[PDB]
Short mmCIF file of C-alpha atoms in Angstrom, two decimals:
data_model
loop_
_atom_site.label_atom_id
_atom_site.label_comp_id
_atom_site.label_asym_id
_atom_site.label_seq_id
_atom_site.Cartn_x
_atom_site.Cartn_y
_atom_site.Cartn_z
CA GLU S 28 38.82 -1.27 -60.36
CA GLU S 29 41.87 -3.53 -60.10
CA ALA S 30 44.17 -4.16 -57.14
CA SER S 31 46.61 -6.64 -55.63
CA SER S 32 46.39 -7.99 -52.09
CA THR S 33 49.95 -6.81 -51.50
CA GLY S 34 49.12 -3.35 -52.81
CA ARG S 35 47.90 -0.43 -50.72
CA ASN S 36 44.32 -0.23 -51.99
CA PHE S 37 43.24 -3.83 -51.39
CA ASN S 38 39.70 -4.37 -50.08
CA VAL S 39 39.58 -8.04 -49.08
CA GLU S 40 35.92 -7.83 -48.10
CA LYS S 41 35.26 -7.38 -51.82
CA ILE S 42 36.53 -10.83 -52.80
CA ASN S 43 33.87 -12.43 -50.63
CA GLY S 44 31.36 -14.78 -52.25
CA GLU S 45 31.01 -17.16 -55.19
CA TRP S 46 33.91 -17.84 -57.55
CA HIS S 47 34.87 -20.47 -60.13
CA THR S 48 38.17 -22.02 -61.13
CA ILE S 49 38.82 -20.94 -64.70
CA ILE S 50 42.49 -21.75 -65.20
CA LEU S 51 45.15 -23.42 -63.06
CA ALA S 52 48.89 -23.44 -63.82
CA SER S 53 51.90 -24.87 -62.01
CA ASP S 54 55.62 -25.40 -62.65
CA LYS S 55 54.84 -28.94 -61.48
CA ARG S 56 52.00 -29.86 -63.83
CA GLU S 57 51.14 -33.14 -62.08
CA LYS S 58 49.88 -31.10 -59.11
CA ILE S 59 47.03 -29.71 -61.22
CA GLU S 60 46.33 -32.69 -63.47
CA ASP S 61 43.59 -35.29 -62.90
CA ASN S 62 43.62 -36.36 -59.26
CA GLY S 63 46.37 -33.85 -58.48
CA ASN S 64 46.01 -32.40 -54.98
CA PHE S 65 45.84 -28.85 -56.34
CA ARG S 66 43.31 -29.36 -59.12
CA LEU S 67 40.80 -27.54 -56.94
CA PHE S 68 37.56 -25.99 -58.09
CA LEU S 69 36.99 -22.94 -55.93
CA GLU S 70 33.34 -22.26 -55.18
CA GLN S 71 33.26 -19.72 -52.33
CA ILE S 72 35.46 -17.34 -50.34
CA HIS S 73 34.32 -16.23 -46.88
CA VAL S 74 36.19 -13.25 -45.50
CA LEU S 75 37.02 -13.16 -41.80
CA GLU S 76 38.99 -10.55 -39.84
CA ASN S 77 42.37 -12.27 -39.97
CA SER S 78 41.52 -15.13 -42.26
CA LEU S 79 39.91 -16.48 -45.40
CA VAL S 80 37.75 -19.57 -45.63
CA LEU S 81 38.07 -21.20 -49.04
CA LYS S 82 35.40 -23.65 -50.15
CA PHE S 83 36.33 -26.03 -52.97
CA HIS S 84 35.35 -29.31 -54.57
CA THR S 85 37.86 -31.92 -55.69
CA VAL S 86 36.98 -34.35 -58.47
CA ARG S 87 37.62 -38.08 -58.55
CA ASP S 88 35.87 -40.02 -61.29
CA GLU S 89 33.02 -37.63 -62.13
CA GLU S 90 32.26 -37.27 -58.40
CA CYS S 91 32.78 -34.15 -56.28
CA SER S 92 33.93 -33.87 -52.69
CA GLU S 93 33.71 -30.63 -50.71
CA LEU S 94 37.03 -29.38 -49.33
CA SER S 95 37.54 -26.45 -46.97
CA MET S 96 40.66 -24.47 -46.13
CA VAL S 97 41.35 -21.70 -43.66
CA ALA S 98 43.95 -19.22 -44.91
CA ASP S 99 45.47 -17.04 -42.20
CA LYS S 100 47.17 -13.71 -42.80
CA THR S 101 50.95 -14.11 -42.60
CA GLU S 102 53.31 -11.32 -41.56
CA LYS S 103 53.64 -10.18 -45.19
CA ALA S 104 51.04 -7.78 -46.58
CA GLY S 105 48.26 -9.39 -48.62
CA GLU S 106 49.72 -12.85 -47.99
CA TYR S 107 47.96 -15.87 -46.56
CA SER S 108 49.16 -19.27 -45.46
CA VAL S 109 47.42 -22.61 -45.16
CA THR S 110 48.51 -26.13 -44.39
CA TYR S 111 47.44 -28.46 -47.18
CA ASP S 112 49.61 -31.11 -48.83
CA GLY S 113 52.48 -29.11 -47.38
CA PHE S 114 52.93 -25.51 -46.26
CA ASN S 115 51.30 -22.94 -48.54
CA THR S 116 51.49 -19.18 -48.81
CA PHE S 117 49.61 -17.17 -51.42
CA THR S 118 48.85 -13.64 -52.50
CA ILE S 119 46.36 -12.13 -54.94
CA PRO S 120 48.54 -10.23 -57.44
CA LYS S 121 45.47 -9.00 -59.29
CA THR S 122 41.69 -8.95 -59.08
CA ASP S 123 38.91 -6.55 -60.05
CA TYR S 124 36.61 -8.04 -57.41
CA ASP S 125 33.51 -8.46 -59.55
CA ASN S 126 34.89 -10.52 -62.41
CA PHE S 127 38.36 -12.03 -62.11
CA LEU S 128 40.83 -12.93 -59.40
CA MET S 129 44.38 -14.17 -59.91
CA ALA S 130 46.10 -15.98 -57.09
CA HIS S 131 49.77 -16.93 -56.82
CA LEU S 132 50.66 -19.73 -54.42
CA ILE S 133 53.94 -21.23 -53.25
CA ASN S 134 53.90 -24.72 -51.74
CA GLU S 135 56.61 -26.31 -49.61
CA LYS S 136 56.49 -30.01 -48.80
CA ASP S 137 59.70 -30.75 -46.88
CA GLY S 138 62.35 -30.43 -49.55
CA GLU S 139 60.80 -29.41 -52.85
CA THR S 140 58.95 -26.20 -53.69
CA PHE S 141 56.47 -25.57 -56.50
CA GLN S 142 54.45 -22.59 -57.70
CA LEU S 143 50.79 -22.45 -58.61
CA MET S 144 48.87 -19.68 -60.33
CA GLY S 145 45.07 -19.63 -60.30
CA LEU S 146 42.55 -17.66 -62.39
CA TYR S 147 39.06 -17.45 -60.87
CA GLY S 148 35.90 -15.84 -62.20
CA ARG S 149 32.60 -14.67 -60.72
CA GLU S 150 31.11 -16.53 -63.70
CA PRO S 151 32.09 -20.02 -64.98
CA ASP S 152 34.27 -18.37 -67.67
CA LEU S 153 36.40 -15.33 -68.50
CA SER S 154 37.29 -13.42 -71.68
CA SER S 155 40.37 -14.31 -73.71
CA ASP S 156 41.97 -10.95 -72.91
CA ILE S 157 41.89 -11.80 -69.21
CA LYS S 158 43.06 -15.38 -69.72
CA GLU S 159 45.99 -14.03 -71.75
CA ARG S 160 46.93 -11.50 -69.06
CA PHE S 161 46.94 -14.47 -66.69
CA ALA S 162 49.06 -16.53 -69.08
CA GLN S 163 51.66 -13.76 -69.30
CA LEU S 164 51.78 -13.57 -65.52
CA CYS S 165 52.31 -17.35 -65.35
CA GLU S 166 55.29 -16.97 -67.69
CA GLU S 167 56.81 -14.22 -65.57
CA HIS S 168 56.75 -16.71 -62.68
CA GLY S 169 58.53 -19.37 -64.71
CA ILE S 170 55.46 -21.47 -65.47
CA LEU S 171 55.50 -22.85 -69.02
CA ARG S 172 52.49 -22.14 -71.23
CA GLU S 173 52.05 -25.88 -71.65
CA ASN S 174 51.64 -26.10 -67.87
CA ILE S 175 48.60 -23.81 -67.99
CA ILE S 176 45.32 -25.76 -67.86
CA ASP S 177 42.03 -24.12 -68.84
CA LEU S 178 39.27 -25.76 -66.79
CA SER S 179 36.45 -23.55 -68.12
CA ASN S 180 34.53 -26.39 -69.77
CA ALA S 181 35.28 -28.92 -67.04
CA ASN S 182 31.65 -30.02 -66.55
CA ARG S 183 32.94 -32.23 -63.76
CA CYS S 184 30.71 -33.98 -61.22
CA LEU S 185 27.49 -35.49 -62.46
CA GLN S 186 27.86 -39.26 -62.28
#
């Protein structure tokens, strides 16, 4: 089963649990490159009534640091907002709950705006068919293919 958070059949409770960052993409590549504030490895999603708790790890020189975020429902359906390196709003254009989840985020940091697309998997990797579907979605949002970073084999953190 597939659905979008903005759609009518979304079941947010179903995205609860462990996840992994598979691919990140942004129209501002630096944001997702080494040490970029958005090169975040998602590990867990806790579903609350009007919010989402996102648990990540950031990587700086083969060393992880746990980072938490609280995403609150905005006034738009299936949309969440969180303050982090600016003002962020995101939706989940597509997920099948038990395998992949695609998130689309828009960040505003007084002045400039940038888009981020994220592909997450219940397992540390996803099929090529899914990664391609994600790639096509990135393109529809104006994100160049060369700005899509596959972090599947990013065996980060193990100094």
